[model samples]
Target: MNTFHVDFAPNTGEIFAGKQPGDVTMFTLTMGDTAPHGGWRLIPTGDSKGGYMISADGDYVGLYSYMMSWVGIDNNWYINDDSPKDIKDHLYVKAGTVLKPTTYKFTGRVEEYVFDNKQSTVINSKDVSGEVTVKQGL
Candidate 1:
């Protein structure tokens, strides 16, 4: 299934209030660090290099808090891979891609991410939803 290309309000990539016909957005990239829990829409630059994160669009979250999880005000919870390891090339997306009322997992396809500290590196990501598992522990 294909999803729509959602763009936030230019400088403020904030989630649109009252988004109708909700959908789940996901971008695949090589995981580098495990995200915590919250609403976020990231860009998969690809490879072990951490994907660019944009929670609620350019509004920006001041800290290095990972995209751990999410759930619409009237939706289910989307959990993140709480692993100390990194998963490369995970899916990055918004909250308007998922169909509804159901949980969506990452597409577990991680490759080793080698990098320095100041840089985002590691391999951690997977799709445990719909029984679509891909060695997420990679």
Candidate 2:
């Protein structure tokens, strides 16, 4: 199997106002009965400050968006930000110096982005290569 990997940066497409770099950014993965978790984010895991939530414009979820539900049930089932703690621990971010409007490459493929227009936060994402896209647009 191919190794799963990806890289990202603040897309700078919009001025997203939310948690600071040090503060935790959360993403979720719902597995039927699995509990939603938080406190973790998709950040780099090495001396090189690479990997993060970057986007082109508008609201977008991270690479895992497609894995998110494709069906639309906009009432309260749209808690895209409510990420699980276990998965969150796997990815993380930190305050660093990186040029904006950059398209840093990662092995993973961008699939979705969680956009909360009311909240004004975004988490652009990519999926492991070869995986069928299972997400929809915001």
Candidate 3:
């Protein structure tokens, strides 16, 4: 099983007065070259501080790419992924063995939303990259 734990905080001075980190209502995971899979939606970790967790079993090995998206109570959706235009900025994961499940922890800041009608609500800009750590087992 591959496990992912994600935590995000609002950008400095960008969070609305009524918003909290845990105000997220929807979360999803998408693998590279793969369609949105059923059950790919993540579940809240039962923490008031706001975090999400999900696990899946598959032949997820080698250097793989993926993206994460979520919706907040504010009715805005957000995304965090490797930059789409720059290969150097692409994010990747090294899948681990079955006996030793891989765990990826992503910590990022939710920046201001973009008002592009052609695009989604907000996307973690390339300038504001998230920190990711990968560990094997437990």
Q: What TM-score goes with each of the models?
A: 0.19, 0.21, 0.18
Q: What lDDT tens digits, residue by residue, belong to model 1 across residues 31-131?
A: 33333321223322222113223232222211111233322341222223434454332233343332222222321222223334433343333322111
Can you give the lDDT of residue 56 in candidate 3? 33
**Model 3: ten consecutive residues of lowest lDDT:** 33-42
- State residue 103's C-alpha deviation in candidate 1, in Å: 1.9
Candidate 1 error regions (>4 Å): 1-91, 95-98, 113-138
Which 10-residue window of candidate 2 scores lowest in summed lDDT? 129-138
Name the TM-score of candidate 2.
0.21
Tens-digit lDDT track for model 3 on 1-138? 222223332222221222223322122233221222122222232121133222233222221223434444532223433322211112332232222232323332333223444443432221112222223423
- What RMSD, rounded to one decimal, does every model reach? 16.1, 16.5, 16.8
Candidate 3 regions exceeding 4 Å error are 1-39, 52-66, 74-138
- Model number with the top lDDT: 2
Candidate 3 lDDT score at position 125: 24
Judge candidate 3 at residue 64 and give its lDDT. 21
Pairs clashing within candidate 3? none
TM-score of 3: 0.18
